[PDB]
Design an enzyme around this catalytic site. Structure first.
Site, PDB file in Angstrom:
ATOM      1  N   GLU A  90      30.767  10.544 -21.296  1.00  0.00           N
ATOM      2  CA  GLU A  90      31.658   9.925 -22.264  1.00  0.00           C
ATOM      3  C   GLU A  90      32.515  10.926 -23.034  1.00  0.00           C
ATOM      4  O   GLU A  90      33.530  10.548 -23.589  1.00  0.00           O
ATOM      5  CB  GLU A  90      30.828   9.203 -23.334  1.00  0.00           C
ATOM      6  N   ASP A  93      39.554   3.617 -24.601  1.00  0.00           N
ATOM      7  CA  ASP A  93      38.780   3.989 -23.445  1.00  0.00           C
ATOM      8  C   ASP A  93      39.538   3.759 -22.104  1.00  0.00           C
ATOM      9  O   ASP A  93      40.695   3.387 -22.077  1.00  0.00           O
ATOM     10  CB  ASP A  93      37.391   3.383 -23.506  1.00  0.00           C
ATOM     11  N   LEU A 123      32.164   1.964 -28.614  1.00  0.00           N
ATOM     12  CA  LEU A 123      33.224   0.974 -28.536  1.00  0.00           C
ATOM     13  C   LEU A 123      33.535   0.338 -29.885  1.00  0.00           C
ATOM     14  O   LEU A 123      32.668  -0.045 -30.620  1.00  0.00           O
ATOM     15  CB  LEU A 123      32.963  -0.119 -27.518  1.00  0.00           C
ATOM     16  N   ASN A 161      24.700  -0.686  -2.262  1.00  0.00           N
ATOM     17  CA  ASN A 161      25.040  -1.934  -2.922  1.00  0.00           C
ATOM     18  C   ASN A 161      25.640  -1.626  -4.288  1.00  0.00           C
ATOM     19  O   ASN A 161      26.527  -2.269  -4.813  1.00  0.00           O
ATOM     20  CB  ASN A 161      23.744  -2.772  -3.066  1.00  0.00           C
TER      21      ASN A 161
END
Ligand code: CL
Ligand code: CL
EC number: 3.2.1.17
Length: 162
Positions: free
Chosen positions: A11, A20, A32, A132
């Site tokens: 981050e 962001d 956030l 996946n």
């Protein structure tokens, strides 16, 4: 290496409000603020979060402080999550860090949606889950970061971050 360090690398650290990767107002270490397009709305959330009239700039200590809360909240969200908890319980220390990062980045709800990968992680089918996990918007939008997390699930080591 640990969760803190890991996320600190993913981050980065910023002391002024910024936007962001999805264009939302954030600050500090991936904290956030708001999804709202309003800067004011963001400054307000900020001041509320810090407990002072910041004016869109905080200190390193404040940053770190938000960071700790955010990490704690994330573990905590995992532990309360009926779909997450079991996964997390089944994993080793490194991989747990990987699940926490995902949670930090995307919210518990976001994460719980990877049903199928979750199932695979639980069964310890490493290569399969990695493939996946990769078929996702998440991987398509922030691929380098996603690659880091995935390798982590796959190998159970910190190699991706060294
Ligand atoms: Cl907060
Ligand atoms: Cl990325």
């Amino acid at each position: 290496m640990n969760i803190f360090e890991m996320l600190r690398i993913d981050e980065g650290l910023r002391l002024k409000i910024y936007k962001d990767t999805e264009g939302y107002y954030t600050i500090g270490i991936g904290h956030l603020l708001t999804k709202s397009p309003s800067l004011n709305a963001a400054k307000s959330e900020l001041d509320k979060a810090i407990g002072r009239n910041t004016n869109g700039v905080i200190t390193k200590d404040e940053a770190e402080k938000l960071f700790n809360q955010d990490v704690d909240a994330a573990v905590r969200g995992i532990l309360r999550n009926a779909k997450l908890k079991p996964v997390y319980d089944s994993l080793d220390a490194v991989r747990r860090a990987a699940l926490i990062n995902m949670v930090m980045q995307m919210g518990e709800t976001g994460v719980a949606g990877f049903t199928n990968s979750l199932r695979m992680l639980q069964q310890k089918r490493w290569d399969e889950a990695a493939v996946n996990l990769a078929k996702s918007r998440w991987y398509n939008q922030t691929p380098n970061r996603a690659k880091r997390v995935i390798t982590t699930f796959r190998t159970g080591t910190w190699d991706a971050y060294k």
